[PDB]
Every structure is written in C-alpha cells, then in structure tokens.
C-alpha cells in the first residue's frame, strides 16, 4: 500500500487526499514506523479491536 507522511494523512480536506489512501482506513497508509509512533500497538491489535474503539482512537489522532 502507498504510504504518506502524517501531515498529509491528517489533512481533513477530502479533495486533497491522495488517490492512494483509503479515506476510511488512513492508518493502513502510515509506514510501520509511523504506525507504532501514532498508535503504540501492533496493526493486528488495532484492527482486531471493535470498530468503535478504532474510530475513537483515530479521531484523537486526526485520522478519522
């Protein structure tokens, strides 16, 4: 998957978001390094928790 810097991904102007980002799964488009820095858990731990908690966390991070 295409990865992008955090500032690009937390840009909430939809028209600006690069085509290569799933707007509903922005966390998938952080590098592994940035995923750890932003969330502090494995991708699996995040993805396998309930969607509401995923969304709540992403709102805090600017990634919802």
Swiss-Prot record:
Post-translational modifications reported in the UniProt record: Phosphorylated on tyrosine residues. The unphosphorylated form increases the initial rate of actin-nucleating activity, whereas the tyrosine-phosphorylated form inhibits actin-nucleating activity, enhances actin-bundling activity and enhances actin-severing activity by reducing high Ca(2+) requirements. The tyrosine-phosphorylated form does not regulate actin-capping activity.
Domain of life: Eukaryota
Membrane-spanning parts: none
Location(s), subcellular: Cytoplasm, Cytoskeleton; Cell projection, Microvillus; Cell projection, Lamellipodium; Cell projection, Ruffle
Coiled coil: none
Region (Absolutely required for activity): 58-61
All copies of domain HP, residue ranges: 1-64
Tissues/organs with expression: Specifically expressed in epithelial cells. Component of brush border microvilli.
Result, substituting residue 25 to A: Reduces affinity for F-actin
Headpiece, as annotated region: 1-64
Protein family membership: Belongs to the villin/gelsolin family.
Name under which the protein is recorded: Villin-1
Organism field: Gallus gallus
Taxonomic lineage of the native organism: Eukaryota, Metazoa, Chordata, Craniata, Vertebrata
